Design a protein around this ligand. Structure first.
Ligand SMILES: Nc1ncnc2c1ncn2[C@H]1C[C@H](O)[C@@H](COP(=O)(O)OP(=O)(O)OP(=O)(O)O)O1
Ligand SMILES: Nc1ncnc2c1ncn2[C@H]1C[C@H](O)[C@@H](COP(=O)(O)OP(=O)(O)OP(=O)(O)O)O1
Ligand SMILES: [Mg+2]
Lengths: 357, 150, 357
């Protein structure tokens, strides 16, 4: 059973990242892993609000766009709104009952909070380029080309949340719930957590960065620059976010935090590879919908798909997964600039006399 | 561990409960006053050997300056504090002496007129001491008391 | 079953605050109840970091304190750390799975995040007034005068989280779990939510404000002034927090959101009254412990207990509960400064001639 303030006085430095004793006292004078304390300090320093960015010029640029470029921009915006809509609530719902050290708990809430600023900034951009935002928002849930990708990401979250409730209500063991038998395995829960973090890592380090290329491709042509200013701030947060999931995954995989997890991480290695590869294919599939009605200067279906394979290899290698695509140089090198902050007249005849022609 | 200097010159350990008791007495029955306000507005600077008579004069000033439209009863809290301080200044205690004993000492010191003893007998002085109601000092306002001692 | 992104396209303006369809798309262009959108905007505008406040001078003030006043100060700090430790995680864990409108979901996440800043600032204050912060932190979980109210407060949260898991895992109905019969009533879940929010309202609107009196009483003596600046910033957030819970409670009680809920709110009126009365009594006992070894200029058992009765009547009145204490004027009026932000010489003889002396 989960408790908001566990009664036991435990040395938090010796607890694992997850599944240990629920955090009681929130102290920040010490850390087990100081990576999360640094991520908090850094995310707090990046704090920005959407309204403090000038986006007034973006309505004119948007309405002046060709119809198929309106499609590219507003579709990449709807997909962005969807992903960070999930990301606003999910790390809080899926991870907070499992975390057992205070620095990781506070980071997850800070991580989630910064995502709500993203959700609010999407509403800010939308309400300043279109005439009725309701048309844009209502299409996110009903558009069949969008909501398909939503259920793939949310499933890993939902399944981890469900197994977590059983593990809290019933504990580990074989149970019978309304006749049917229900087995609660902590090893299968640790397996659902690790798979979930892998899905989120592909979401924030591959899926969103494919979206960043679209927003910044308009900016390289000096268009939608108010949007680009916000997306650049969002990308700065997203770099902290994916670093968090990388460190969690690598600490779990190496067994430094939980030896049982090193075993479990190997049993998922194939699922994780297929998980990341699938994400890349889904984003390549999404690219086909963006350019269904035409392309633009500097970005088409081929270019964006090459960046999907380029960025996927980097992310998968960072978490110890095999590279699924061919080696390739960066197809859009311009994106890197967005994802980070007397004559000395004296003569000596004697020296010349010491010569032989 | 520090010491306050009492009125009689002796010293004892500083006890804020003595201050709480005085103010609770002076605020008794009054509406919309605050013991905490008087103590904090005093900004009383303690030091080892601080005179207890200077301490009291500080909280009188503090309570007097809290007289406002929203808290008019501070006029009575500061007055009761000021009467208390004035009783000690003249008598060393709270209860005043007998009317005769006082007039005797005062005419002897040249502070009162000589005729008081000649025109009234001790039996007559004790009869007027029964007229006195020393509780009527509790019906003054602070402005009245300052004009009295001033 | 809870889902991080519900597939159904629901008009979010017609959903209730709680127990409706899980929020899917996070939009901020419209609200059902706009009180929470204002709370978000106001909390986002109050964003502060603990390190931006100078607390180095406070160590000198602390070490010069009397021995019993070090205890008064440090006990109120341990209690503060505990309450905002619970408040850091609990609104996210206890409320996010139940919320069904986006503005209330995002507010709860912003509310929770702002509480983690408080927890971080307590680590900041502690690290700058005591020599070993471990001495303060390790005492928080075992402390007798604290752990009594700690387990009482967390219980309302823990019980709501548990019933929520059953309601998501099993749904409403009579169930059998390993032989023992388990009844899942949505009406009983709506009752545990209302009781929890009432407990949280007393937690943030009475318990903390009794603590505010202690922190600011030292500040009126120009002591611990770096602490006072942080507690002042905390008090500004705490006013937003209790306003959120007040609007939630009143919207539930008035039945605007759920007709069933108006009836349920009446069935709890006596339990809620006893809830607040117990909290007020617990704090008066806590006050009796603070001054066991002496008082200070401007604060003793009487003064603080009078403020307990004063602030309790105010809070209970705001949520439609009967006043348990006698009417009283503010015993510490100074606390309000911390909780809220020639001659016109011309002559006319003819006009004067029109006279008769
Ligand atoms: N031990 C103490 N420490 C600090 N302040 C004190 C103490 N005792 C009394 N006071 C304060 C309370 C009063 O408001 C103020 C005047 O006290 P008062 O009783 O007139 O002085 P005293 O006790 O030295 O004279 P007396 O012998 O006439 O009582 O001094
Ligand atoms: N009936 C009363 N009339 C006047 N004052 C009263 C009465 N009852 C209580 N008090 C208050 C006035 C004083 O503040 C306090 C007692 O005064 P005082 O003799 O100075 O005691 P104290 O606290 O200073 O101890 P000590 O004088 O022995 O050091 O009680
Ligand atoms: Mg005395």
């Amino acid at each position: 059973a989960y408790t908001t303030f566990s009664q036991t006085k435990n040395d938090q430095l010796k607890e694992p990242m997850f599944f240990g004793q629920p955090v009681n006292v929130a102290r920040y004078d010490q850390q087990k892993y100081d990576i999360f304390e640094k991520l908090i300090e850094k995310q707090l320093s990046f704090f920005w609000r959407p309204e403090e960015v000038d986006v007034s010029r973006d309505r004119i640029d948007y309405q002046a766009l060709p119809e198929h470029e309106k499609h590219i921009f507003i579709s990449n915006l709807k997909y962005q709104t969807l992903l960070d809509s999930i990301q606003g609530r999910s790390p809080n719902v899926a991870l907070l009952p499992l975390i057992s050290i205070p620095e990781l708990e506070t980071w997850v809430e800070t991580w989630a909070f910064s995502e709500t600023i993203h959700s609010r900034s999407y509403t800010h951009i939308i309400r300043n380029i279109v005439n009725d935002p309701s048309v844009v928002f209502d299409d996110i849930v009903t558009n069949e080309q969008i909501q398909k990708r939503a259920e793939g990401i949310s499933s890993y979250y939902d399944e981890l949340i469900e197994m977590t409730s059983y593990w809290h209500l019933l504990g580990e063991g074989t149970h019978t719930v309304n006749g049917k038998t229900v087995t609660v395995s902590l090893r299968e829960l640790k397996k659902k957590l690790y798979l979930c973090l892998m899905s989120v890592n592909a979401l924030e380090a591959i899926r969103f960065y494919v979206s960043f290329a679209c927003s910044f491709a308009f900016a390289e042509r000096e268009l939608m620059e108010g949007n680009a200013k916000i997306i650049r701030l969002i990308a700065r947060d997203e770099a902290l976010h994916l670093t968090g999931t990388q460190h969690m995954l690598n600490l779990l995989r190496s067994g430094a935090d939980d030896p049982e997890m090193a075993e479990i991480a190997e049993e998922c290695k194939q699922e994780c590879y297929d998980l990341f590869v699938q994400a890349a294919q889904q984003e390549k599939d999404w690219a086909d919908y963006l350019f269904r009605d035409g392309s633009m200067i500097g970005l088409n279906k081929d270019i964006l798909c090459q960046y999907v394979e380029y960025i996927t290899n980097i992310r998968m290698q960072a978490v110890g997964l095999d590279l699924p695509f061919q080696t390739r140089s960066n197809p859009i090198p311009w994106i890197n600039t967005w994802l980070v902050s007397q004559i000395d007249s004296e003569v000596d005849t004697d020296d010349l006399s010491n010569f032989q022609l | 561990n520090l010491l306050v200097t009492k009125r009689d010159g002796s010293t004892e350990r500083i006890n804020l409960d003595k201050i709480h008791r005085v103010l609770d007495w002076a605020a008794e029955g009054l509406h919309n006053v605050s013991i905490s306000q008087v103590e904090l507005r005093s900004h009383i600077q303690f030091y080892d050997g601080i005179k207890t008579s200077d301490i009291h004069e500080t909280i009188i000033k503090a309570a007097a300056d809290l007289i406002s439209r929203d808290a008019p009863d501070y006029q009575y809290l500061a007055a009761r504090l000021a009467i208390f301080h004035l009783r000690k200044k003249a008598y060393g205690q709270f209860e005043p002496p007998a009317l005769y004993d006082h007039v005797v000492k005062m005419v002897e010191m040249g502070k009162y007129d000589n005729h008081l003893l000649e025109d009234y007998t001790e039996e007559e002085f004790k009869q007027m001491d029964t007229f006195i109601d020393h509780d009527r000092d509790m019906t003054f306002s602070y402005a009245a008391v300052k004009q009295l001692e001033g």
